[PDB]
């Protein structure tokens, strides 16, 4: 499932980041980093949804979770 973050997708993300040449092992490292980031954000979002006594994670929960970590996100009813 984490492997659903394919090698070409990480290549595209690196390219959008201005990366010209990518090492072979960068893909597994990037998968790990993305997993850590998603773990933090989703943990905070689920905390927010639990505190609201909801079984559905709303975009507002994600926005608040991101705002908590200093990654304010615009465009989802912030």
């Amino acid at each position: 499932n984490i492997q659903g973050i394919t090698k070409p997708a990480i290549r595209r993300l690196a390219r959008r980041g201005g990366v010209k040449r990518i090492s072979g092992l960068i893909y597994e490292e990037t998968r790990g980093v993305l997993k850590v980031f998603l773990e933090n954000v989703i943990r905070d979002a689920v905390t927010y949804t639990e505190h609201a006594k909801r079984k559905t994670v709303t975009a507002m929960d994600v926005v608040y979770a991101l705002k908590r970590q200093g990654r304010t996100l615009y465009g989802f009813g912030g």
Binding site: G17, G18, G70, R71, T72, Y74, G75, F76
Partner: protein, 54 residues
């Protein structure tokens, strides 16, 4: 700034890309929205010098 960017793109309606361009190109706005990510904004076209062909 966003309408300026939209004109440069020959578009009459501001989309998130234009807002991102206006914010990031401007130094002061970019500093204000330093820790902000604009959905569907993309990034400024920027390639490091050493990566360009000789």
């Amino acid at each position: 700034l966003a309408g300026n960017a939209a004109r440069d793109n020959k578009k009459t309606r501001i989309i998130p890309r234009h807002l991102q361009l206006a914010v990031r190109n401007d130094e002061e706005l970019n500093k204000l929205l330093g820790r902000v990510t604009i959905a569907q904004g993309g990034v400024l076209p920027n390639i490091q010098s050493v990566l360009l062909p000789k």
